[PDB]
């Protein structure tokens, strides 16, 4: 199986769709394997630009085709959905100082 950019799930912006697509789910153990190495940007682009940022994926695709390898990461969508799910309860979760 192989995939660069395919469909994305609706409830949470994640690549599994359809034939199997989406990477071999980058579990917590693989996150630890990245953390043991000194690779931080690899993990960031792994779980922010390649996976969950609806803006980031396209804003990165455009820079890749422009010949400029950068990233404006932003916030992953699963964390935003979780903020909304927590705030749905009687729990007030906010984002503090600039």
């Amino acid at each position: 199986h192989a995939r660069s950019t395919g469909s994305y799930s609706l409830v949470t912006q994640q690549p599994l769709g359809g034939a199997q697509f989406g990477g071999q789910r980058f579990g917590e153990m693989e996150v630890w394997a990245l953390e043991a190495y000194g690779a931080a940007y690899t993990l960031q682009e792994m779980l922010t630009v390649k996976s969950d940022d609806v803006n980031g994926r396209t804003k990165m695709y455009k820079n890749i085709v422009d010949g400029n390898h950068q990233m404006e990461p932003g916030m992953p969508e699963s964390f935003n959905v979780l903020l909304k799910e927590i705030r749905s309860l009687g729990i007030n979760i906010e984002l503090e100082d600039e």
């Binding site: 789910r25 394997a33 043991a36 390649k50 996976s51 990233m71 979780l82 705030r87 309860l89 100082d97």
Partner: protein, 489 residues
């Protein structure tokens, strides 16, 4: 961007601050035109448009109308993505306890007011009344009285003696008390008599209330006056194949909450007897608790489905909640996997990569390089070229693959050497060729084991792969200086 995150109890004012409108119906869609019924769980007025930059009626339909509020349907025209962000609220007729603070192992509401859990639960069920603000009477501001006691109790003092039953009583208990008063006395109490029980209840309660007061959250907010609702697109009703629809069971739970709250309001306006309204308050408490966290109550069955319904806490917690399955670990683009083979002719710092996998993987870089070298007029033409698989694009893939390492991983990832960076070597076939000396680091047999590959996109990722995760750079094990590249069999 931002810094530290804060968490606290939600004021009802704050709940309404997140909220733009109140849901007042259990309806979702019109059932023929699947447009959202205003104003319900799915509502365009409260939440937003179904389609991008369009009113529900269509009078202010053009895309130039940004930020205008319609007046035939009350819809604000923006992207439909805000149908996933905006919140709503519901005004509860009777107060309702938050089951998270009631059923937490150190019950927050119970431990706060120095009261056992069984008594609070017996009060919430209208099995027994409870005093509040007695002034100068026989009983203290908190006690339990059966109905035959409450009968001849009020005959002793009609005024100066307030005694309610249910969730309103717990809210009056939380609001009546101001914790400075009950802290200043606990000071002396915990000062004098030794009594290990005394110091234990002291340390726990005194720390609770002092750290409580430091923040500013008020105890009354453990009782829910207003209920925030989840945005509709987070619990969608999207149509499925064959005319059938798919929805989160959240919708059913919110539906029951709205239905029973409106029925309670109607019973209040109908002057119903006390038995019926108490039953309805208990049922509304049950519904709210089933919504917040299903499992600490009767475990509400689904509709025509025997399994329980996924609640909000069920969405959050667990090995499949949004924490373990989404935030810590996530599916990734620009990735693949396949069965692995040997490829002994490889030098150590490389691996065999099939052609089709490398083509599907490096698609954006292929497009960029093709349109940079002028071999493609535009990006659409580049995609057409690779979909045709013209013979010229293979050399472009050679160009983009040369100094671009890839990451290989096996399923049982135990140590950091479970992931290693190699240099791609284009190979005819559909199998990955992994250097044999690394198999010991992978514990990878050739008995059908499959491995996955990932592509470092940004420059920083490529340099981290070449300098840190490279197969040549990792020869000594981290657990012990012994080499991990030892010849195997």
């Amino acid at each position: 961007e931002f810094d530290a995150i804060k968490i606290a109890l939600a004021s009802p004012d704050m709940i309404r601050s997140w909220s733009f409108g109140e849901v007042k119906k259990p309806e979702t869609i019109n059932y023929r035109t699947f447009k959202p019924e205003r104003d319900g769980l799915f509502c365009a007025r409260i939440f937003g448009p179904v389609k991008d930059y369009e009113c529900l009626c269509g009078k202010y339909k053009r895309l130039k109308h940004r930020g205008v509020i319609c007046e035939k349907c009350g819809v604000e025209v923006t992207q439909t993505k805000v149908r996933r962000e905006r919140m709503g609220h519901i005004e509860l007729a009777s107060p309702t306890a938050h089951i998270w603070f009631l059923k937490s192992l150190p019950s927050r509401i119970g431990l706060l007011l120095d009261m056992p859990l069984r008594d609070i639960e017996r009060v919430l069920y209208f099995e027994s009344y409870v005093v509040i603000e007695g002034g100068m009477t026989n009983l203290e501001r908190q006690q339990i009285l059966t109905e035959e006691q409450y009968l001849d109790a009020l005959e002793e003092f009609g005024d100066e003696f307030d005694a309610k039953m249910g969730a309103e009583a717990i809210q009056a208990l939380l609001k009546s008390m101001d914790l400075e008063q009950e802290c200043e006395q606990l000071r002396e109490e915990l000062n004098e008599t030794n009594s290990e029980t005394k110091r234990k209840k002291l340390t726990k309660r005194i720390k609770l209330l002092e750290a409580f007061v430091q923040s500013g959250n008020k105890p009354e907010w453990m009782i829910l006056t207003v209920l925030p609702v989840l945005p509709p697109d987070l619990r969608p009703l999207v149509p499925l194949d064959g005319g059938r629809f798919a929805t989160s069971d959240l919708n059913d739970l919110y539906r029951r909450v709205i239905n029973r709250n409106n029925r309670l309001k109607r019973l209040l306006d109908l002057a119903a007897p006390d038995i019926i309204v108490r039953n309805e308050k208990r049922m509304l408490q049950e519904a709210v608790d089933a919504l917040l966290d299903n499992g600490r109550r009767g475990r509400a069955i689904t509709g025509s489905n025997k399994r329980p319904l996924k609640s909000l806490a069920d969405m959050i917690k667990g090995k499949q909640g949004r924490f373990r399955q989404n935030l810590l670990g996530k599916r990734v683009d620009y990735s693949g996997r396949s069965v692995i083979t040997v490829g002994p002719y490889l030098r150590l710092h490389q691996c065999g990569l099939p052609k089709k996998m490398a083509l599907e993987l490096f698609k954006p870089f292929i497009y960029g390089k093709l349109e940079l070298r002028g071999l493609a007029t535009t990006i659409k033409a580049a995609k057409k070229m690779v979909e045709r698989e013209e013979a010229v694009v293979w050399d472009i893939l050679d160009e983009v693959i040369r100094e671009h390492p890839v990451l290989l991983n096996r399923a049982p990832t135990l140590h950091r050497l479970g992931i290693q960076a190699f240099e791609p070597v284009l190979i005819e076939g559909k199998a990955i060729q992994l250097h044999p000396l690394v198999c010991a680091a992978y514990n990878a047999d050739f008995d059908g084991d499959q491995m996955a590959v990932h592509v470092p996109l940004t420059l920083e990722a490529q340099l981290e792969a070449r300098a840190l995760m490279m197969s040549t750079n990792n020869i000594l094990s981290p657990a012990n200086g012994e080499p991990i590249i030892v010849p195997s069999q």
